[PDB]
Ligand binder design. Structure first.
Ligand SMILES: *[C@H](S)C(=O)c1cccc(C(=O)N[C@@H](Cc2ccccc2)C(=O)OC)c1
Ligand SMILES: *[C@H](S)C(=O)c1cccc(C(=O)N[C@@H](Cc2ccccc2)C(=O)OC)c1
Lengths: 301, 301
């Protein structure tokens, strides 16, 4: 019993984190096989961040300008190249702790674990969701860029995020491991801002199923709704539309609890229109949208 | 920026988890140096749980009755003994991955990370607080006992909790690593239940300081209160009394934000008496009490 925001065990990732320094900028990197991946912003100067041409900045660097430290061991850089907004530093030692891994780009509404690191040293692990507006609500301080996000399946680490920056509202933006940004953000100084966001409906329904599995039933009712009538309500409250694929994905949890998906949608409509009237669900007084159907099944089996 | 429930990186702990089997009962154990620690309930049968005499049950066992598996490698048990409610299995191999460690008993109101495991395999990591009533609000399924809780300082793992059971309200009980239970709970079948709980006031104030550090200020006011008048309000709302030691511990966060502790207590009094009026703090619509002053300082530096 119980339901917590649970991250994947981080050991496999911890054995990949290193420190990368170029001039006076120090950040984190990810060491897999004989390559270290890190944000290309490591090569910038403070006065470069105004429309830096990164191809020019990199051509002016050599291998010896990159100091890579893994624990207390310096790794010799023997090649460098850029891929989109990430730097690839070839080193002369393959990481003996490389896990099986994949680089996978995630979708908005999917969750992942973040290993926050400073100076190549892991500090904390937590779960995050990619928001519909392609930001994440992380916890990151100066020095955390290059920290990565990941999911683990069997023994395979699927890396999905590399941290780059903080936007003015305090939310975070970064790229995939191929160096392509999530969202309409860039690694330079502009007035860029998070766009409007929405609530991830299918995840809210998944979490209501978690609550039922864990004994919270007060919000249930005998009603059902149609998908169309539900989505009229969703649109009014800035919730994403619910698709038949979403309904299908909720199939297992509906079968486990015996509560039809459209039946649970009637409960969600009531909660949106009426609020909670002083009650809580799974220890929250708000509707939670950062757990996917998979997250619920994994934790509530 | 940002504020998340953050756990410690779990790799050091992961390298200590093993599977312990006795007869048909399988659970997790913690392998440090040449000893494996696990709940003594592993030696019980289903019909033993009615007032089992564990000294009799253990005398009837031999080393070969314990199967310890670390990954895919069986460890030979060469001695067994009981310490309070934990079993100590001496094995013929020292764990090469033993971290520096300590066994430390925590107090109610302190937090720790839990590495939930099944069949000696880590599944997830999350943060928990020891409640005033000595339970924890975990997330644990059948097979998770022997999973441990811990804090990490520098390179030293301080183990503080070993999971044993779930109480009827869905909250969890266990022991320290010396096998002594937290709270008035026992490892046998009874009608035992969690006692009345309270809210951890000093942690709520720590979290209000985190919110201010992160830009949430709407709950601030120009008022102050005395400690006595505040504690009259705390008692009414089932909050723990605030001591001068608590005030002292909040000293750094008060200095960082410029908000006196008693000043913040006036805000908390207003929130308790008036509620939130539709607003949120750090993404919550309830007052959060599972972050200690130390947790805030570590994450909000
Ligand atoms: C480090 S988390 C990183 O990868 C990164 C990516 C994009 C932008 C920034 C960043 O902080 N830029 C600042 C300017 C700067 C910082 C450090 C060295 C040189 C220049 C900035 O002004 O935006 C916040 C970091
Ligand atoms: C496993 S998490 C463990 O250590 C433990 C400690 C105390 C009590 C129990 C427990 O589940 N007892 C049940 C009976 C039982 C289970 C398994 C084998 C033998 C007997 C019980 O009835 O209480 C929930 C487990």
């Amino acid at each position: 019993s119980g339901f917590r925001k649970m991250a994947f065990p981080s050991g496999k990732v911890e054995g990949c984190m290193v420190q990368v320094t170029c001039g006076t900028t120090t950040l984190n990197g990810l060491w897999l096989d004989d390559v270290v991946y890190c944000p290309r912003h490591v090569i910038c100067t403070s006065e470069d961040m105004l429309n830096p041409n990164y191809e020019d900045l990199l051509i002016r660097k050599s291998n010896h300008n990159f100091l890579v430290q893994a624990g207390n061991v310096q790794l010799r850089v023997i090649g460098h190249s850029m891929q989109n907004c990430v730097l690839k530093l070839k080193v002369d030692t393959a990481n003996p702790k490389t896990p099986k891994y994949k680089f996978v780009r995630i979708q908005p509404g999917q969750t992942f674990s973040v290993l926050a690191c400073y100076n190549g040293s892991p500090s904390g692990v937590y779960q995050c969701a990619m928001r519909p507006n392609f930001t994440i609500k992380g916890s990151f301080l100066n020095g955390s860029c290059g920290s990565v996000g990941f999911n683990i399946d069997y023994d395979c680490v699927s890396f999905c995020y590399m941290h780059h920056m903080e936007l003015p509202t305090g939310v975070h933006a970064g790229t995939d491991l191929e160096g392509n940004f999530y969202g309409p953000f860039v690694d330079r100084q502009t007035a860029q801002a998070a766009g409007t966001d929405t609530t991830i409906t299918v995840n809210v329904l998944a979490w209501l199923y978690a609550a039922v599995i864990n004994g919270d039933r007060w919000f249930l009712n005998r009603f059902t709704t149609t998908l169309n009538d539900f989505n009229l309500v969703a649109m009014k409250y800035n919730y994403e539309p619910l698709t038949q694929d979403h309904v299908d994905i909720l199939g297992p949890l509906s079968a486990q609890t015996g509560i039809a998906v459209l039946d649970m949608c009637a409960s969600l409509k009531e909660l949106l229109q009426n609020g909670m009237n002083g009650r809580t669900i799974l220890g929250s007084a708000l509707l939670e949208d950062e757990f996917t159907p998979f997250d619920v099944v994994r934790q509530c089996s």
